[PDB]
Each structure stands twice: as C-alpha cells, then as structure tokens.
C-alpha cells in the first residue's frame, strides 16, 4: 500500500510517511514528508524523465551538481529514492530539506524591509560566489529558485539548467533561440549570447533585486523580443561603446534602427529604496555584460557592508552532453547508487 499525492504513486517508504502536497512543475512533484530516521519533515520531489534525451539530462546536472556542492546558502541533496535494478527503476524520488517557502510565493504575500533585501540579496550572492567559483552557471535564477525557512535563511536550488562556463564560445547570432525563464534573461541572450558566460546569472540577480524592492517584475515582458523592449525601455538605448561590444550586424542594426529612449532613474522607479541597493542593482543591471558587476566585486558593495566577510564566503575545492536517454539512465542509476542499501 505506498502512498500517494494527488494521484501520484510516491514510492518512498517506509523511511518517509505523512506525505502533504507542496507544488508541481514540469519537473514533476514536489511533497512534504516525515523522515523517520532523522525524526524531522523533509521534501521530496517524484522525477519521471527517463523518456526523453533532455529530462535525462536535466536530471543528471542537478543530482551531480548537487551532490558535489556543499554549500550553506544551496540546497543539498539529503538522500535519493530508486527501485533496485535500471529495469526497474521509472521514478527517482530526490530528498531535500524542507524550505518554508521560496522567494516567488514571498514576494507574492510579503512586503520587504530593506534589512530582509539586504540579507536576502547578500545570501544570494554568498551561494553564487561558490557556484562561479566551480566554474559553474545557473541559468536560471529566479524568485522561485531561492528557498526560505523560517528563520530567512535562504538556499538557490534548481541546477537543471546549469553548465560549466565558457567564455570563449559564448557568441551566437541575433534572435537564437534560448530556454532560461524570460523576465530574468539578459539583453545579450537576444543579441548575440549563448548564456556561457557568468554575466548571465548577475543579470538574473539584478533582475531579482529589483523584484525584492517593489515586489513586481522589473521587466516582464511578452516573448523573446518583447523583453527587449523592457529592458531597453528602463536601461534606455546603449552608447556607442556597447554597440562597438556588438559585431553581428542584425543585432546591431536592430538597435541601430530604435528611437532615441532616455534611461529611467532607479530612484524613480524605486523611491523607497535604499540609495546604496539602488547603486549594486545599476551595476547589475549594466548592458554591457563585460562591463556588468561580478560575484565577488558585488559582495564587497557598501550596501552589503555589514555581511560583507570574504573569509566566511566560502568556494569550492575544484572547479567542474550529447549520450542518448538510455546511456543517461544508466549514468543517473549509477549517480544514485550512493543512497541505496550499502
Ligand atoms: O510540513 C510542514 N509544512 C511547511 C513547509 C511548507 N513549504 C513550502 O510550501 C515550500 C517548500 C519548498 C521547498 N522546500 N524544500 C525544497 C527543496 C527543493 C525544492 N525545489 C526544487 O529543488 C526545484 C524542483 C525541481 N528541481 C529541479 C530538478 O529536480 N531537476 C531534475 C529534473 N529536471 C527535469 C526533469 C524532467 C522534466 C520533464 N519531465 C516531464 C516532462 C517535461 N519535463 C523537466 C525537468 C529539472 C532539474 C528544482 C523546493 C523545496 C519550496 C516552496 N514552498 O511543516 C514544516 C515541517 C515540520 C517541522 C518544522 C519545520 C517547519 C514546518
């Protein structure tokens, strides 16, 4: 008799009962449980991908990467729940520990004080300065990427997304096409970035700093152009300079082809805001990806500046695929094998 959540078999026991409905995703379905071993309440999210290429791979990132960080402000893996045998084995159940809740929801419900900003924004950073460090990009950082307990400590989560940096092989054409989430995309996805390089993830930072300010999305726009005219439309046009950046004619004469638009003032948008937060979110938030604020140059900001303490910001020991979905299983199989009985 396992039990089961909204019409789900979860097949995790006897180790883990008294299972509640957190949410779902593409992904699959996220629940509460009781660990009987540790004697406290966990999460465990029910992954089903071993159909197709792209689940297997986004599966294999985030158990490996997972498992190789160790980090106070990212989520870890506590334990994984497989059948026995590949043959067997259709679900994998991924055990982690529970959150009260993520920065979406948060910001859905929840006005900020400038001091939960600050907390909130210098935890974000912490983790990220571990990730960068492993030569890693996120991808996909976002509101509902970044977990909370009850006591505000916050931890990034979902490494689906994620691949290992490389600059030297960034450079695409105009309009390419991109999967990371579209209100959190920097300008240069759309005009000539594969999203290798660490650029991408400040951005997305930036993009969240905002959010936390005023609790809306700072550019939320309609589809890959139309987050565009967000950006543009807030940042203003770009100077010759960071079109010089921009090699590849028909994103340059796209720019080239805009009116005029004069950039909005921060403390306009955002006249509450701590003049400090307003100065880092204008370094984030730079058009020009190489000229864009990094990890550790933003931990040092004076708005940060009484968490600031690189010894206690940890990275990692060392830094860090086209194989079929039945190679990816059997990698995933042998990944997990940690966990079972032995
Ligand atoms: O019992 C209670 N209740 C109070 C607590 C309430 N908590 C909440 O409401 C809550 C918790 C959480 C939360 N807590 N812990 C978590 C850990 C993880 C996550 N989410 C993730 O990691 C996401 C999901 C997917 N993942 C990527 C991924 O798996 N991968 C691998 C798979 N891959 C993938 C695979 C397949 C596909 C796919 N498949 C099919 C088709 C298409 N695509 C797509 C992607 C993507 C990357 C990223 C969230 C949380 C978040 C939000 N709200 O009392 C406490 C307990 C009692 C005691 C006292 C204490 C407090 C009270």
Same mark, same amino acid.
């Given at each position: 008799?396992?039990?089961?959540?909204?019409? %789900?078999?979860?097949?995790?026991?006897?180790?883990?009962?008294?299972?509640?409905?957190?949410?779902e995703?593409?992904?699959?379905?996220?629940?509460?449980a009781?660990?009987?071993?540790?004697?406290?309440?966990?999460?465990?999210?029910?992954?089903?991908?071993?159909?197709?290429q792209?689940?297997?791979?986004?599966?294999?990132?985030?158990?490996?990467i997972?498992?190789?960080?160790?980090?106070?402000?990212?989520?870890?893996?506590?334990?994984?729940?497989?059948a026995?045998?590949?043959? %067997?084995?259709?679900?994998?159940?991924?055990?982690?520990?529970?959150?009260?809740?993520?920065?979406?929801?948060?910001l859905?419900?929840?006005?900020?004080?400038?001091?939960?900003?600050?907390?909130?924004?210098?935890?974000?950073?912490?983790?990220?300065?571990?990730?960068?460090?492993?030569?890693?990009?996120?991808?996909?950082?976002?509101?509902?990427?970044?977990?909370?307990?009850?006591?505000?400590d916050?931890?990034?989560?979902?490494?689906?997304?994620?691949?290992?940096?490389?600059?030297d092989?960034?450079?695409?054409?105009?309009?390419?096409?991109?999967?990371?989430?579209?209100?959190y995309?920097?300008?240069e996805?759309?005009?000539?970035?594969?999203?290798?390089?660490?650029?991408?993830?400040?951005?997305?930072?930036?993009?969240?700093?905002?959010?936390?300010l005023?609790?809306?999305?700072?550019?939320?726009?309609?589809?890959?152009?139309? %987050?565009?005219?967000?950006?543009?439309?807030?940042?203003?046009?770009?100077? %010759?300079?960071?079109?010089?950046?921009?090699?590849?004619?028909?994103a $340059?004469?796209?720019?080239?082809?805009?009116?005029?638009?004069?950039?909005?003032?921060?403390? $306009?948008?955002?006249?509450?805001?701590?003049?400090?937060?307003?100065?880092?979110?204008?370094?984030?938030?730079?058009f020009?990806?190489?000229?864009?604020?990094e990890? !550790?140059?933003?931990?040092?900001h004076?708005?940060?500046?009484?968490?600031?303490?690189?010894?206690?910001?940890?990275?990692?020991?060392?830094?860090?695929?086209?194989?079929?979905?039945?190679?990816?299983?059997?990698?995933?199989? !042998?990944?997990?094998?940690?966990?079972?009985?032995?």
């Amino acid at each position: 008799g396992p039990e089961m959540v909204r019409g %789900q078999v979860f097949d995790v026991g006897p180790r883990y009962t008294n299972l509640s409905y957190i949410g779902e995703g593409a992904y699959g379905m996220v629940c509460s449980a009781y660990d009987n071993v540790n004697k406290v309440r966990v999460a465990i999210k029910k992954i089903s991908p071993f159909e197709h290429q792209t689940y297997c791979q986004r599966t294999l990132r985030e158990i490996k990467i997972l498992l190789r960080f160790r980090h106070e402000n990212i989520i870890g893996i506590n334990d994984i729940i497989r059948a026995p045998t590949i043959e %067997q084995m259709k679900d994998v159940y991924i055990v982690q520990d529970l959150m009260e809740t993520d920065l979406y929801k948060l910001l859905k419900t929840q006005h900020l004080s400038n001091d939960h900003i600050c907390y909130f924004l210098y935890q974000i950073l912490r983790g990220l300065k571990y990730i960068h460090s492993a030569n890693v990009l996120h991808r996909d950082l976002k509101p509902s990427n970044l977990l909370l307990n009850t006591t505000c400590d916050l931890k990034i989560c979902d490494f689906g997304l994620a691949r290992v940096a490389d600059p030297d092989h960034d450079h695409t054409g105009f309009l390419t096409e991109y999967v990371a989430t579209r209100w959190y995309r920097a300008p240069e996805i759309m005009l000539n970035s594969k999203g290798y390089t660490k650029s991408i993830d400040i951005w997305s930072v930036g993009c969240i700093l905002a959010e936390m300010l005023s609790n809306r999305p700072i550019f939320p726009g309609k589809h890959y152009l139309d %987050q565009l005219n967000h950006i543009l439309g807030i940042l203003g046009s770009p100077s %010759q300079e960071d079109l010089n950046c921009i090699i590849n004619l028909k994103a $340059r004469n796209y720019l080239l082809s805009l009116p005029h638009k004069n950039k909005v003032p921060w403390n $306009r948008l955002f006249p509450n805001a701590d003049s400090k937060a307003l100065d880092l979110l204008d370094k984030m938030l730079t058009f020009n990806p190489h000229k864009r604020i990094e990890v !550790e140059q933003a931990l040092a900001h004076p708005y940060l500046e009484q968490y600031y303490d690189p010894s206690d910001e940890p990275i990692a020991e060392a830094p860090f695929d086209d194989l079929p979905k039945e190679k990816l299983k059997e990698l995933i199989f !042998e990944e997990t094998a940690r966990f079972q009985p032995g």
